[PDB]
Every structure is written in C-alpha cells, then in structure tokens.
A paper describes a structure:
Partly conflicting data on the allergenic significance of dimerization were reported for the birch pollen allergen Bet v 1, an outstandingly well characterized model system in immunology. It is the archetypical representative of the pathogenesis related protein family 10. Here, we report crystal structures of dimeric Bet v 1, revealing a noncanonical incorporation of cysteine at position 5 instead of genetically encoded tyrosine. Cysteine polysulfide bridging stabilized different dimeric assemblies, depending on the polysulfide linker length.
We hypothesized that this linker density is related to the observed redox dependence of the dimer. To test this hypothesis, we soaked crystals with β-mercaptoethanol and subsequently determined the crystal structure at a resolution of 1.63 Å. The resulting electron density at position 5 could be consistently interpreted as cysteine. The reduction was accompanied by a reorientation of the neighboring Phe3 side chains in both monomers for ∼170°, now partly occupying the position of the phenol rings of tyrosine observed in WT Bet v 1.
Numbering used by the authors:
A (entry chain A), B (entry chain B): 1 to 159
Amino acid sequence: GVFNCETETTSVIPAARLFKAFILDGDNLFPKVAPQAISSVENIEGNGGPGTIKKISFPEGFPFKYVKDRVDEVDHTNFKYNYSVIEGGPIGDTLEKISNEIKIVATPDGGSILKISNKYHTKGDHEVKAEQVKASKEMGETLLRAVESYLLAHSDAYN
Amino acid sequence: GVFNCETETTSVIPAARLFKAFILDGDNLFPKVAPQAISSVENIEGNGGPGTIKKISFPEGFPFKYVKDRVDEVDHTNFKYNYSVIEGGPIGDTLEKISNEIKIVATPDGGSILKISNKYHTKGDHEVKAEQVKASKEMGETLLRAVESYLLAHSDAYN
C-alpha cells in the first residue's frame, strides 16, 4: 500500500534563513543544536548532491540506532528538499521506503511554515505503524525547535 | 493550518459494484448493515448529488451525536465521491472542515482499492487531533467491512 501524510508546522524564523540552517547545513547543525537527539550525520556515498547517501546516527536509548537517507533533490529557489528513507529506522518488516518532501514557505508576518510530506510504501494490505508516524512527528518537531532556538540566540548565524 | 491524510484500502468487491453499494446507496445500506456504527442518514437538502447536505446520526455512547456532510461531486464513470464534513462530530474548537475525496479503482484480481484523501482545515498553528484520524479510519474500515459482508451474502444486490 501507499500512505501519504502532509503536515504544516509554523516557525518564527524567516524562510530563507531557515532553509540555509535546517536544510542546507543540517548535517552540521543538527548534531550541534540537538546532540541529545542526533549523534552524527555522515556521507556514505556522494557529496551532498542528488543521489548522495547519508547516515544519521541516534544516541543509545532511542528506538532506532540509525537511518540512511538518499538525497533526491535540493531546490534553492523554492526552498524544497526531497529525500528518501531507505535503510534503518522504521525500514523493515512491512515498510520498504519513506519518500519525503520538506518545503519551507515564507508567511506574511515574516516567519515561515514547513510543509512536509511523508509517503510510506508498505507491504500489500499492511498499514503504517502509527507509533512510528507519531515518533517521526516528535523527532522532527524537536529538531526544528532546537534549530529555531539556536538561530534566535545567534543573529549572525545563517545571515 | 492544513493537514492531508491519503490512504489505500483493499476490497474484494469489484469497483463498479462497490461504488453502487458503498457510495451510491450508502444512505440506505449503512444503518441496515452497520447499526452499531451508523443510526441514520437523512438528506437535509437534495437527494444525494452535488450540493446535498446529509445528517448522519451515530449510536448512543459514540463520542459524537451526528455529523453534517455536504456532497461536493459524484463521478459515476470514474467512481469518484467528494464530500465535506461541515458540522457536528469533530467540527468545532480548532477544526473548521474536513474535505474528503474517495476514488475506487479496479485491481487485476477482480477486486478494488479505495483511495481516500482527508484534508483538515485547522485553526492557525493547531494540529489535527490524532484521535480524530484514528476514529475516521476505524469508522471507514467498519463500514466497508459491513458492506462487503452484505454484498458477499447477497450476490444479486447491486450487480
């Protein structure tokens, strides 16, 4: 089966700056601002460009040890990041892939919204494990607020 | 905000027949085959086509007493049914409307798949209540299963 979840999350950070921090410098910023949630991010294969395989490791005690993501597209004009979750994390049993899109959209007040899509490919009639979707929502919200807080404390970062 | 959920549900019933029974005659069938889920369905306006407002009443002890749904489109050839939840049920507090799109498609084995999209309009930063998503999905499954069982017991119905 295929299950698709599209969400919107508000940020007080301007879209261009948040895109630079959260997407373009995520590999460096995530372990820095949320070290208790992200142990490391490393390139397994490639540069950061389309096709690149990246391994994200999590601290001991978390439900998963690591995940491997494949970078699919990075659109700097439209602040859009497409990637696939292809190994580790929730991949296994009846889940083969998660195809993700993150689009950071400016709002009239000068902040932004993260428009996020998660497309799950499950085996046949099986449904997405609801508590993985929930945990995924929580991990992403934690990273976002940690990035926000860092940016608000460091006005010179990602100008 | 806007939240969108897209699911796929397998049915053993051929697409044309499932559309006839589950969509086109649901008002009649649901209270008869699933009285534990649906108490009644009544047209407040129209007779089932676009613009029709229907009141769906639930059994005693359900979280909600009723919902009002507006029929948006009904495609008899492509087996599409679009409708919106506009009053009662989860509508209130931070949720204004749920816009639903159902598409029934044939599968090679002679059965069908229901492709279902639910778009929630929430107030500002507020999230869609996860328990409403579970409840909506569980309701759909229950009704589909009741209609399936009825159709398999009555081979002359909607054929």
